[PDB]
Design a binder for this molecule. Structure first.
Ligand code: CL
Ligand code: CL
Ligand code: MG
Ligand code: NA
Ligand code: NA
Ligand code: NA
Ligand code: NA
Ligand code: NA
Lengths: 104, 109, 104
């Protein structure tokens, strides 16, 4: 049943990653580039934490273990995957703001 | 299914309707901002938010059902519906960021 | 699991489409608009492959033909939904870069 903690740990870490990435984007918008870079570093860490749980989840099935699929679990997987997506495009927003500061 | 739709099977359709409209409002807003139509963009974002709220109502009921031990039937459509809801939230959140970026680009040139 | 090859195929096509789309963004970022545009055609071709799998998943179920639900399937659907959104917003980024070029 420890495996049934997977959804919670996914949501918690993914939300943390998503939060860091958006914070990074806001810093970049305000011209605080050092703070933006740091937040992204932290976002990368958080997505790593989340991935540990996703990997175990996928390998569990691969391994032949039966997993009771719930809405919560599906929702947890959406959190991680959307977090990865937010982080990837946030990096592009950050990069664009850096480009714009270069010109004045 | 096409032969018979159960009451529970209504949830995915409702989530897709509202989430889809949320995503549509967000993209409409993005497109407005791109044209320098900022007030129309701001208002479409409000409607995006409202549509996510309506979708969210079904979400809470769905999660809580499970909490009660009321096992939901997992289907492709339900998974897809969940994807759409979470997608709408992501699109709205980033479209906000496109809109702000378009406002900044106006502020300069 | 002969139908369980579909998740694998969804993941592969979607992942490649996402990569293609990101390639396009980086090209446009470098001022390489021809390469960007070409990268997006490839993204669209790969999205279509995965999308075709998904339409059949949804339609078959509507017909009463039940699919075996697994973590990998759910994962596969996440890959497509996010690939679609990345492609779509990468296109918005490409437009932003083209915009910045045109003004100078
Ligand atoms: Cl991982
Ligand atoms: Cl190529
Ligand atoms: Mg999903
Ligand atoms: Na960028
Ligand atoms: Na509302
Ligand atoms: Na359930
Ligand atoms: Na922004
Ligand atoms: Na754009």
């Amino acid at each position: 049943t420890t495996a049934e903690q997977i959804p919670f740990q996914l949501i918690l870490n993914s939300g943390n990653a998503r939060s860091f990435a958006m914070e990074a984007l806001q810093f970049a918008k305000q011209g605080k580039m050092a703070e933006a870079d740091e937040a992204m570093v932290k976002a990368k860490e958080a997505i790593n934490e989340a991935h540990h749980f996703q990997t175990e989840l996928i390998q569990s099935e691969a391994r032949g273990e039966k997993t009771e699929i719930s809405v919560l679990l599906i929702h947890a997987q959406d959190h991680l995957m959307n977090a990865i997506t937010v982080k990837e495009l946030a990096a592009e927003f950050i990069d664009l703001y850096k480009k714009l500061e270069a010109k004045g």
